[PDB]
Design a protein around this ligand. Structure first.
Ligand SMILES: [Mn+2]
Ligand SMILES: [Mn+2]
Ligand SMILES: [Mn+2]
Ligand SMILES: [Mn+2]
Lengths: 403, 401
């Protein structure tokens, strides 16, 4: 109120225009993933926290509860196993725009954008833990086909919703133990991708992303689609790199990659999740790396160029909370990065005044961000501070515990 | 030796042709670095008997080469110019300053690889170089790098084997930076300039080398992995992968096959990192073997330009080159003697059991016997006998300095 007004001049002494940051913050959309809501079940025909969603309509209502507690206007990220086959078995190579018709009517209803993923796991045709890179041509051909279907589905979304859909390819391909050939399976991956992307699609409707991973449970020794593979591949073929913050080496940092991608790519894509010693997929927290990512997005004038998304899955807590704690933190960090004096911070590093650059970065860690954040929440009709938690408790009592 | 002959039979049982491997191995050159010899001192205007002159450095190089089987290459740094009387600025370096290097190389059947020197200099005092905010600095280093590209050219013309000019810069910041992008933009502008004039690839090839961090550069490094990997991809240059230069538990091994899909050629420095880019003499370890396997089994023996990059001053410096280069040849050898065909086929077919047993069993196959034969056909001392040469040499020459 005036708690907010005194906070406002503290930033104004630096020439930081907070009113302006709040307009700019209003418009950045976070793509939130639907898989959190039903523990990555999907709707495919053929001891955790209670109350997950188990039907398409339960999942939608849940997405709305979370959105109603998160400020701004955002997007929903779908997986192909979220198809509504209408009680028919439809093979993955056969999924079609009319299978996601309900999702699109619902997105249009709420002003959501929509993003997409082919699903290449939990399937008969993926038991050997190889896929687009399986030695068999009929397996490889099945998954190529499905990725081509998803490309069409994504175009569908962009067509219908008037906003580019990002279709991202992730594969689980690898070997648990030491490989005796690293070159051939990657070669097949290249061929499998050359095919998947054979046909142009208007960039206004769809964009293609590839996401690497360093290792999985069951692919601990070697993953086919690696950081260097997808980097070279994306650059050569004008695709987007999707970076997941849980997908790298120990100590390995995504914030250090962003400025280097920005030099050779018009756009890139982000999945923010929290790794605790593996791609554990913990809920995102307002931590140093999260802020350091935000810093890079803002300093580098990259808000139209970094497509921000969430990737996490905690079933040990309330799932609607996961979504809300996740997104609020990533918004907080953008806000924080928006409230940094980059102009003087940058001149100090140009001039080598490392003393002030250290001093002031340090001192902004206690600048009154809560006060700005709180007001932003109030203007955007969501609960300030820990209040959103009352709303999850009602919803858990009335709705979620009844399932 | 019959001993060899029994070994030969054990490998042949799998279909592996030892004699063919030996003839293959003899063919591969390893780029040996000069800076081991004088502690990266250079000639520009701790264990005793490091070299203090070009002739000493050469004698030492010769002695080392005579304890290593094969016919190899030498890697020079710009600070190793022979400038006769004068002081020459690094932006004024010309081929005439490496004439004596080339005359010696040709005589000895060696190739010469090359590196501009972007460190220990007034103009690199701030720890930025090509990405310095100041034009005059960047400009000066651009010229040095351009001057170096011509010297690589001169080398390759003179030695009828292409020269690898590698660029490595120290640029980064000690503590958390407030702009990670524009220094990288400046490096980009800079290399564009450096590579602007075209040189024939029969004489010279350009490479670029990233690093994660260095002392005084812990927090951020302008020339990062992603940066150079993108750059060499846009402008048809080489990536140089230094095994000492990546995150904890990150292997260069896993990168080789990803990269071969997209570049004709690729360069490596091998050196042992012990918890940082510490540049320890190369050992015959897990990582080395996994690297060797990757080159041999991917057919990249002509596509991967192998070099050394360590600096250990706590032991005999001749010994350093020889242990080091001998393990990288040892490891290539071991990789040629592995039954890839049936191993590839077991993985293709599901039999991961046989894949594991057999990689494992080959860890006891009789490598030594073959290696020993190889050293004798190549007229270098076998096993440890090479210490004696070293010890005679330490006395007669090393210690009268
Ligand atoms: Mn992901
Ligand atoms: Mn993940
Ligand atoms: Mn190196
Ligand atoms: Mn190193």
């Amino acid at each position: 109120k005036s708690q907010f007004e005194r906070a406002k001049i503290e930033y104004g002494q630096w020439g930081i225009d907070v009113e302006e940051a709040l307009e700019r913050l209003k418009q950045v959309p976070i793509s939130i993933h639907c898989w959190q809501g039903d523990d990555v079940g999907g709707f495919e025909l053929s001891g955790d926290y209670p109350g997950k969603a188990t039907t398409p309509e339960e999942l939608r209502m849940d997405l709305e509860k979370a959105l109603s507690l998160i400020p701004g206007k955002h997007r929903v990220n779908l997986h192909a196993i979220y198809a509504e086959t209408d009680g028919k078995v439809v093979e993955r190579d056969q999924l079609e725009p009319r299978h996601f018709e309900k999702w699109v009517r619902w997105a249009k209803r709420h002003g959501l954008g929509l993003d997409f993923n082919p699903t290449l796991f939990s399937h008969e045709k993926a038991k050997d833990g190889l896929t687009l890179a399986h030695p068999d041509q009929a397996i490889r051909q099945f998954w190529i086909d499905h990725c081509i279907a998803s490309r069409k589905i994504g175009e569908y979304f962009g067509k219908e919703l008037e906003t580019p859909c990002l279709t991202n390819i992730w594969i689980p391909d690898g070997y648990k133990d030491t490989p005796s050939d690293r070159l051939t399976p990657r070669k097949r991956l290249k061929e499998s991708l050359d095919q998947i992307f054979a046909a142009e699609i208007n960039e206004a409707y769809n964009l293609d992303a590839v996401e690497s991973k360093l290792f999985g449970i069951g692919s601990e020794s070697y993953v086919v689609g690696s950081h260097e593979f997808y980097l070279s591949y994306a650059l050569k073929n004008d695709k987007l790199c999707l970076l997941d913050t849980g997908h790298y080496h120990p100590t390995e940092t995504v914030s250090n990659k962003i400025s280097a991608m920005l030099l050779f790519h018009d756009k890139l894509a982000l999945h923010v999740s929290r790794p605790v010693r593996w791609d554990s997929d913990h809920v995102v927290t307002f931590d140093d790396e999260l802020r350091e990512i935000a810093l890079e997005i803002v300093r580098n004038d990259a808000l139209d160029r970094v497509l921000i998304g969430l990737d996490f899955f905690d079933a040990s807590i309330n799932r609607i909370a996961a979504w809300t704690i996740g997104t609020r933190n990533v918004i907080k960090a953008l806000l924080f990065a928006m409230l940094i004096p980059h102009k003087q911070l940058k001149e100090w590093q140009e001039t080598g005044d490392y003393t002030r650059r250290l001093a002031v970065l340090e001192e902004f860690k206690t600048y009154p961000l809560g006060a700005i954040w709180n007001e932003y929440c109030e203007r955007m009709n969501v609960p300030i501070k820990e209040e959103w938690l009352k709303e999850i408790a009602i919803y858990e009592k009335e709705v979620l515990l009844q399932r």
